[PDB]
Assembly symmetry: C3
Homo-oligomer: 114 residues x 3
């Protein structure tokens, strides 16, 4: 399935906390999408962010994979919102998520495609 999470968040957090978020994100991907964690990936990007016209700690989480998302979107949102709430104090009302299934031909990994 090759799940990936690009997490763009604007909290003032330590680098350690960013690493813990990346770690928990890969665990979340494996547990909810159901694949072995060795193929789960995550990048955490620090941003300057706003929600509803206000500058507030917030996030956008871009989930992409070679299928495996259909029906699992709700569970992933609840896990990620609890995580960013727990590690960065970001409110659920200030987090957007996106889920996108990609065909193998448009998925690159280790010099090749699927």
């Amino acid at each position: 399935h090759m799940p990936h999470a690009l997490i763009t968040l604007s909290a003032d957090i330590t680098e350690e906390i960013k690493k813990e978020i990346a770690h928990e994100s890969m665990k979340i991907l494996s547990e909810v999408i159901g694949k072995p964690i060795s193929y789960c990936a995550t990048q955490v990007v620090t941003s300057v962010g706003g929600f509803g016209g206000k500058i507030v700690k917030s996030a956008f989480i871009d989930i992409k994979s070679i299928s495996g998302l259909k029906g699992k979107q709700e569970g992933l949102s609840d896990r990620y919102c609890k995580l960013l709430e727990q590690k960065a104090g970001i409110e659920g009302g200030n987090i957007y998520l996106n889920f996108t299934e990609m065909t193998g031909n448009n998925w690159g990994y280790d010099h090749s495609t699927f």
Copy 2:
């Protein structure tokens, strides 16, 4: 009367202050709300500082990823004009060094506050 949930992820490579980045995020959300037509409480924006190039040269540039649950069809031109005027005014980025993408998402692929749509 119809909920659209617009988002703009702005990746730009200008040398600008954090305050100017906040102003960009703020104006971006106003632009989204005014042009896509939704209440601004549902418009969101993240500004990401990058190292960037255009046309083989290293130059002030940006990539603006606009996403929503519909509401984009026909509004892309107006959005391109307002964002290019914004990044030019605040960061000095030329219109010829900004790319934008527009993507309409189905509700089931949109997460918010522990649930989906």
Copy 3:
């Protein structure tokens, strides 16, 4: 008129100069493999904190987007970027994911307008 773009999110500890070199080479790769002139090839290099397989390690995610012109070139594109990131940033091929997306022109904005 393909307008290729590469958004490179990588978590290596590299200099700003090296990041410019990656962006510079990225546009050349776009121009050479998609077959277009480089004047419309564009790239952003974004520094992240990243992991692969539950561990924190240098890794990358590469978002390749254009108005078509990708169909069939993805294999070649993955090979060049994986070699580029290995050579300039020491990132292993097994810690790089890539995505390819063809956009219709009406959903492609540039210089105050669309296509």
